[PDB]
């Protein structure tokens, strides 16, 4: 068994989409309001807002995403954006430091940094355990981007209209991922099941983040520190 | 002739209100998104947003402002905020440099800096001429804060309900200013008329800024760079 021409074209475009939207130099970060050690909410608001723009760019290059209706595109992004940021952040995460390292000690985020942005160990503990278990998977970049696309293209999200179309798109991506792992990932007989478990964990992380984000968004002295894009994407408006 | 006890109490509280809300060290500025030389819109958005918070703090300490209804307080601030920022910015303005110097070459703003925030010489020329003519007045701090309070307490602004109350408050402040100048300002026989002319110029500056701000606010790639407070205060929502 091997992968088809169409299956690897999907992988090609998804890999290119991610390289174009994830900048390993992190040099854009000096443009954010600086970190301060809710001391850290300005910096992390800007970080997340910047990351949302990159997730929108990645999404737009997923085969078939741009052909969905504008509402479905919004629906999928409003529900999944925080999950994709959590998944994509694994690339900067270090097992050795148990934190996210983004090219410079100013842009090294530990758990305590995120408590100074208004969050609690009720979210930060499962998040760090998620990152470490995901890092231990040692995913190929191919598998990493496929999982982001699969996560994004979930039809079981609030607001989606074209359930049938989104599922067919996600089905094809899962097919690609299962085949890639069997053929290209030595010893990956259990990998696909683990990755689908991580998608389950993200739903739980999403739920907890939304809960804690409501606290921020309901206190104007904190919500005023957010960005207009963050207010939109994480807000409760429905199209 | 001399000033009454009640007149100088007004001056006392207005001077204290301004010292508490204008920080001559400008050390808070390192918290703004950095300047970049619409390169400068992030930094100037943060600068203006910070300055709005200080104008609200100053307003709250004007005798009688806090006893107005919440709507009138909002109405006066939404219409006058940009004018008070223009007036209060004269304190950092230099005739020698023709620019605003805020403790550090990173926080020195020339006209070209503000064109990189989306504005045109149609606004920036009258603004710089306003600052230089206002600086040439050599106002006492007493006169400076009285003019900010008078500007803020104008009843002829859209949205105000209690015309009669706001005018009485502004009337008392004008009385204080006229008396202060006659008694305490050597050679100020023409000063009060000039200061009231500057209030006229601010209306013209306000008009032009609102026009150019509409361009920013209508293009989402620029409006997303603004702050939630700036969006509120300069926005067109009416209570």
């Amino acid at each position: 068994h091997m992968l088809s021409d169409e299956q690897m074209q999907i992988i090609n475009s998804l890999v290119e989409a991610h390289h174009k939207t994830y900048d390993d130099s992190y040099s854009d970060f000096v443009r954010f309001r600086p970190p301060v050690r809710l001391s850290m909410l300005p910096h992390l608001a800007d970080l997340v807002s910047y990351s949302i723009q990159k997730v929108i760019g990645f999404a737009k290059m997923i085969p078939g995403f741009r052909d969905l209706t504008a509402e479905d595109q919004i629906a999928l992004l409003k529900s999944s954006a925080i999950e994709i940021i959590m998944l994509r952040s694994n690339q900067s995460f270090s097992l050795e430091d148990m934190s996210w390292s983004c090219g410079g000690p100013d842009f090294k985020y530990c758990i305590n940094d995120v408590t100074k942005a208004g969050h609690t160990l009720e979210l930060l503990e499962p998040l760090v355990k998620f990152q470490v278990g995901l890092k231990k998977l040692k995913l190929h970049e191919e598998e990493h981007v496929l999982l982001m696309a699969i996560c994004l293209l979930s039809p079981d999200r609030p607001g989606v209209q074209d359930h049938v179309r989104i599922e067919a798109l996600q089905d094809r991506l899962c097919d690609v991922l299962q085949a890639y792992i069997r053929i290209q990932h030595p010893g990956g007989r259990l990998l696909y099941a683990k990755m689908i478990q991580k998608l389950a964990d993200l739903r739980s992380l999403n739920e907890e983040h939304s809960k804690q984000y409501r606290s921020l968004s309901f206190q104007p002295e904190h919500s005023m520190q957010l960005t207009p894009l963050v207010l939109e994407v994480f807000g409760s408006e429905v199209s | 002739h001399m000033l009454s006890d009640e007149q100088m109490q007004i001056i006392n509280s207005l001077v204290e209100a301004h010292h508490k809300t204008y920080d001559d060290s400008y050390s808070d500025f390192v918290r703004f998104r950095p300047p970049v030389r619409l390169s400068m819109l992030p930094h100037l958005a943060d600068l203006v947003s910070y300055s709005i918070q200080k104008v609200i703090g100053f307003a709250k300490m004007i005798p009688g402002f806090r006893d107005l209804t919440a709507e009138d307080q909002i109405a006066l601030l939404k219409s006058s905020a940009i004018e008070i920022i223009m007036l209060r910015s004269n304190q950092s303005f230099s005739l020698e440099d023709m620019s605003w110097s805020c403790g550090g070459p990173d926080f020195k703003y020339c006209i070209n800096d503000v064109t990189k925030a989306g504005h045109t010489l149609e606004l920036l020329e009258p603004l710089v001429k306003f600052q230089v003519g206002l600086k040439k007045l050599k106002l006492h701090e007493e006169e400076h804060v009285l003019l900010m309070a008078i500007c803020l307490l104008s009843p002829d602004r859209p949205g105000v309900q209690d015309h009669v109350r706001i005018e009485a408050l502004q009337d008392r402040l004008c009385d204080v200013l006229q008396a202060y100048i006659r008694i305490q300002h050597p050679g100020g026989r023409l000063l009060y008329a000039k200061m009231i002319q500057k209030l006229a110029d601010l209306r013209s500056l306000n008009e032009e800024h609102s026009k150019q701000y509409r361009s920013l606010s209508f293009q989402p790639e620029h409006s997303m760079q603004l702050t939630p407070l700036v969006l509120e205060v300069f926005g067109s929502e009416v209570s």
Binding site: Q53, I56, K60, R66, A70, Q73, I74, L77, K78, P228, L229, E232, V233, E237, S239 | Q219, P220, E221, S223, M224
Partner: peptide
């Protein structure tokens, strides 16, 4: 509503 998202989504 969703003014920025619409613009970013082209």
């Amino acid at each position: 509503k969703h003014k920025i998202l619409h613009r970013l989504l082209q």
